[PDB]
Design a protein around this ligand. Structure first.
Ligand SMILES: [Zn+2]
Ligand SMILES: [Zn+2]
Ligand SMILES: [Zn+2]
Ligand SMILES: [Zn+2]
Ligand SMILES: [Zn+2]
Lengths: 290, 477, 95, 89, 84
């Protein structure tokens, strides 16, 4: 009811002691959360986003309580605390208190070595939110220290970890790719080839988008040779997504540069790469249109 | 890593002492796994960043109270980054230039309360901050602090701009802190509270503690009546500690319409419901006002007085529990209770009316007509406890306190309806027999029920027997 | 002002983990697994534009050359093309 | 990405607005593509009315986003073909 | 620790290949073994298609796998029919 009233009217009429009582009430409500009350998490996000810049005196108390609950025995408590970080990163960055958000990013970088998959996916989503609301230049720890830490996490087999980490890698490669050398990006592409054999279609779609972002960053030649070798090398219930990635790379990187190698790949008699060349051509034409 | 104070001892048979990279950690012999764990904790210049953040936090504190101690200016010593690693010699970290000639005492410990201050005088001041990684043999911080202070002031290699100053030593391996050196007046409780706040909530110290916790993979699983009015007679001494009467001032008026404030003596109440003993720790008339941090430093002085009274008391005289109220100034009380941890401070479902605890004539006359910390003790139910049990006398004392907090005239009429209820001078309650105190408690409960029905706009007799007994004992109703 | 510190001069980092992100030993690696480029302690301790006259009422012509209005009018009246790079400005004296 | 079964409604479209769940989000409702979401989806009739309010016009999950036609299906204007909500027959 | 009795590993290895790389290496080795046995047997009926498929010209039969042609050795009756 409080979330619906705040989303309907707003938080303009809230008094200062009333705001302190609301912050204490929602902190005790989050402190006693036995079930998976995600609508209560959305209500928390709605109340603090309606408050906006008035939560700046209450921010270190919220940060201290969340960082205390991140050391809990239960995995669900740590998952809920990282979800609260992911909800409140935007309103933490509205006041431009970059020291507290950078400290939270440093603590989450320390927490990146967790073994539980739901907790690790929640930490990755919170880090993705923090990078989206801060920007690359004032991001402590830096991207040149962050992405090598994210490189072995792509070898994980759990779906939520893969989805959140591929989303973070895609946000970095679309936005802040200048900090990372091309050798590391080629290592990312070689990991993304193994990531293409997943089960959720959103994981494969975001994988194809990361392939397009890396080819826009570093150049469309070596990644195209890697994708062509994967197309001629797979022979399984995948590799249509390899053709989708080839078409996305060509559409993002001026398809005159891609079409000689794709045309010369048709001469290989290996009975499956020609169908991949034709499927990539069809997806390329559907992507480029006129 | 978990037994690293014991494995990495300083007192060994043979060993070439070497310093670990970018730290002040000393190793005697190449132990590779310990070196790997301690390097993995202290990566990316964590030692220098911890020292820098502590220096900036102390600079922010001294800039926030620049005017209060006649300080002209504060200088951050922009120094080489290798100052935090060198244990052989140390420069100064924070420079203080004063407005006037500061009176400076001889060097002493941070915990030294007694300090005759008129040794010498000077203007400039230096503060040094030292970080150590103590082991099991040498986790003492105070003797390290005074030894480092003497070996840095006497030796010519350490450069200090003033002969008088202070050195602060922090042991990160045991999370201890101390200081040794000269003092100018007002600085000592400021540095004590600032160091308590810094070791409470430094960000880089939290980064270090989180790295240690993730290295060890540790987790914290922890995030009559059954309340405190009844648990005192349950073979557990629960002493209610109240410090809300420490900030007490009397009422007075001047010749004009404006009124002045009389600095009355502060009182700290320690009530034992299992024995009826109320100890009123008194304060001086010049200590309740004028000094800074009236809600913090006066509470810290009351906590120090309570810790001194607990240490003066025996082990059986010390309480096994503390029936505390809601915490408003109990952070320095819990910080200063390291030497007296036998009583656990917690907030149960039963409270006590401590504001009526000064309602006694003898205790009020002893507290008001004094100017020194006498720390007196009286009996709540001096004669009513011999005609009842421990819980019944505790409930009768709580009902008398609730009646005195409700209406003093009705409580005096119920307790002392005539001149035959005159007790001894050490007794707070009125003189009564068993049936006379039973009738006085019945009249006090009737007056308290009438006052509760007048305040809550309800009937006095509409409550249940358990609710009336909980309201008499001070619990929730 | 000498402040020499006897360091431990064996940085035990996995070179395969440091520049790749993958180690063949895995959890049985002798050295520690960390990817950073921070310096060590011993590395830190070891370390009218032709006549050059004034311009009044400036304006840019069709050849993207900015000059004074009288100078641009004289250049447009004297020659059909600009003197910057012989572009086809067609003697346009416009702001 | 289609199946030979599952004819949809073949009904005349109305003012009700289509709705997509996150499991099949971003897909075209006809040719199952992901290119140029141009034309909004109209779901004709009691596909919207009743217990199926705000549901998926595909598999049947709780819908979160507006469904769209792609530009390639509206090149031949297949969006006027009728309601695209799947009825399992 | 016993450094000379740990399991053997070399730096800069790259790790063990996945199931797809091992499967295509096994398929390439099976193709090499089938071609070696065809060249040892000197059978002229084996042909490789322009799309890259095994064909028996004496039987005029396509084969999906190498062992499909390796089991095509009916072929004697088809060879007797195609002999004339
Ligand atoms: Zn390694
Ligand atoms: Zn759906
Ligand atoms: Zn379509
Ligand atoms: Zn329909
Ligand atoms: Zn044959």
């Amino acid at each position: 009811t409080i979330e619906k009233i705040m989303g309907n009217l707003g938080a303009a009429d809230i008094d200062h002691k009333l705001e302190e009582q609301l912050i204490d009430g929602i902190l005790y409500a989050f402190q006693e959360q036995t079930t998976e009350d995600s609508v209560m998490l959305n209500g928390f996000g709605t109340v603090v986003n309606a408050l906006g810049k008035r939560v700046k005196p209450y921010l270190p108390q919220i940060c201290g309580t969340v960082l205390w609950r991140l050391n809990n025995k239960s995995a669900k408590v740590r998952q809920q605390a990282a979800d609260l970080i992911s909800r409140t990163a935007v309103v933490m960055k509205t006041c431009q208190e970059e020291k507290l958000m950078g400290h939270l990013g440093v603590v989450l970088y320390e927490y990146l070595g967790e073994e539980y998959p739901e907790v690790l996916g929640s930490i990755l989503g919170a880090l993705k939110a923090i990078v989206n609301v801060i920007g690359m230049h004032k991001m402590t720890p830096p991207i040149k220290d962050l992405l090598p830490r994210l490189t072995p996490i792509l070898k994980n087999r759990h779906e939520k970890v893969q989805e959140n980490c591929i989303d973070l890698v895609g946000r970095i490669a679309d936005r802040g790719a200048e900090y990372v050398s091309a050798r590391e990006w080629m290592r990312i592409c070689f990991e993304l080839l193994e990531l293409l054999k997943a089960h959720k279609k959103a994981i494969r779609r975001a994988t194809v988008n990361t392939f397009g972002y890396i080819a826009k960053a570093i150049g469309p030649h070596d990644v195209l040779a890697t994708l062509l070798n994967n197309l001629k090398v797979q022979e399984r219930q995948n590799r249509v997504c390899t053709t989708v990635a080839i078409a996305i790379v060509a559409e993002t990187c001026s398809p005159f540069t891609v079409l000689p190698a794709l045309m010369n790949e048709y001469r290989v008699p290996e009975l499956n790469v020609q169908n991949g060349v034709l499927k990539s051509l069809s997806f390329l034409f559907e992507y480029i249109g006129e | 890593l978990w037994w690293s104070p014991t494995i990495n001892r300083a007192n060994v048979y043979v060993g070439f002492q070497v310093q670990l990279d970018l730290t002040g950690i000393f190793m005697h012999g190449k132990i590779p796994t310990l070196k790997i764990s301690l390097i993995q904790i202290f990566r990316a210049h964590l030692w220098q960043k911890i020292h820098e953040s502590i220096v900036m936090d102390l600079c922010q504190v001294f800039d926030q109270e620049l005017d209060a101690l006649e300080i002209e200016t504060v200088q951050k010593e922009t120094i080489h980054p290798r100052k935090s690693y060198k244990m052989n010699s140390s420069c100064a970290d924070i420079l203080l230039f004063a407005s006037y000639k500061w009176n400076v005492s001889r060097p002493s410990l941070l915990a030294d309360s007694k300090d005759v201050m008129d040794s010498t005088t000077t203007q400039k001041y230096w503060i040094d901050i030292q970080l150590r990684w103590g082991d099991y043999d040498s986790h003492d911080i105070e003797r390290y602090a005074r030894a480092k202070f003497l070996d840095y002031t006497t030796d010519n290699m350490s450069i200090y701009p003033s002969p008088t100053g202070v050195l602060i030593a922090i042991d990160l391996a045991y999370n201890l802190h101390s200081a040794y050196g000269n003092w100018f007046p007002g600085s000592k409780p400021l540095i004590q509270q600032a160091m308590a706040k810094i070791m409470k909530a430094n960000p880089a110290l939290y980064v270090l503690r989180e790295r240690i916790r993730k290295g060890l993979q540790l987790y914290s699983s922890e995030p009559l009546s059954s309340q405190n009015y009844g648990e005192l007679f349950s073979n557990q001494i629960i002493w209610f500690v109240d410090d809300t009467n420490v900030y007490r001032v009397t009422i007075h008026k001047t010749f004009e319409g404006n009124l002045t404030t009389k600095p009355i003596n502060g009182a700290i109440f320690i009530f034992n419901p299992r024995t009826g003993q109320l100890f009123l720790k008194i304060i001086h008339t010049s200590v309740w006002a004028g000094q800074k941090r009236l809600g913090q430093l006066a509470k810290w002085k009351t906590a120090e007085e309570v810790a001194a009274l607990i240490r003066s008391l025996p082990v059986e005289e010390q309480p096994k529990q503390i029936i505390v109220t809601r915490k408003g100034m109990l952070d320095p009380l819990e910080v200063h209770l390291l030497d007296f941890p036998n009583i656990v401070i917690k907030g149960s479902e039963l409270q006590l009316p401590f504001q009526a605890c000064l309602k006694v004539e003898k205790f009020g006359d002893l507290i008001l007509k004094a100017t020194e910390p006498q720390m007196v003790l009286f009996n709540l139910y001096d004669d009513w406890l011999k005609t009842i049990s421990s819980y019944t006398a505790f409930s009768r004392l709580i009902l008398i306190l609730r009646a005195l907090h409700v209406n003093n005239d009705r409580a005096k009429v119920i307790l002392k309806p005539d001149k035959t209820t005159i007790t001894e001078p050490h007794h707070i309650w009125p003189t009564l027999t068993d049936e006379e105190w039973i009738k006085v408690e019945v009249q006090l409960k009737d007056l308290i029920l009438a006052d509760y029905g007048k305040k809550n706009n309800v009937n006095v007799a509409s409550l249940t027997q358990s609710e009336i007994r909980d309201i008499i004992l001070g619990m929730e109703i | 002002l000498r402040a020499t510190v006897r360091w431990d001069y064996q940085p035990d980092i996995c070179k395969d983990y440091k520049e790749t992100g993958f180690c063949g030993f895995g959890d049985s690696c002798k050295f520690l697994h960390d990817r950073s480029d921070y310096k060590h302690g011993w590395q830190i301790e070891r370390e009218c534009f032709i006549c050059r006259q004034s311009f009044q009422n400036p304006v840019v012509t069709k050849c993207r050359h900015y000059f004074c209005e009288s100078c641009a009018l004289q250049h447009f009246r004297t020659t059909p093309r600009c003197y910057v790079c012989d572009q086809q400005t067609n003697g346009v004296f416009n702001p | 990405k289609h199946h030979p079964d599952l004819i949809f409604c073949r009904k005349q479209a109305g003012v009700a607005i289509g709705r997509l769940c996150e499991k099949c989000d971003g897909k075209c409702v006809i040719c199952d593509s992901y290119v140029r979401p141009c034309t909004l989806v109209r779901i004709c009739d009691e596909c919207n009315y009743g217990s199926y309010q705000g549901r998926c016009v595909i598999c049947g999950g709780p819908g979160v986003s507006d469904a769209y036609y792609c530009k390639e299906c509206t090149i031949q204007e297949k969006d006027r073909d009728g309601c695209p909500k799947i009825v399992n027959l | 620790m016993d450094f000379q009795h740990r399991p053997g590993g070399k730096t800069g290895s790259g790790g063990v290949a996945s199931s797809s790389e091992s499967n295509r290496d096994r398929r390439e080795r099976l193709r090499q073994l089938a071609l070696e046995t065809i060249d040892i047997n000197k059978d002229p009926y084996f042909m490789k298609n322009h799309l890259g498929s095994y064909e028996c010209k004496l039987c005029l039969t396509l084969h999906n796998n190498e062992g499909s042609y390796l089991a095509h050795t009916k072929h004697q009756t088809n060879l007797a029919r195609r002999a004339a």
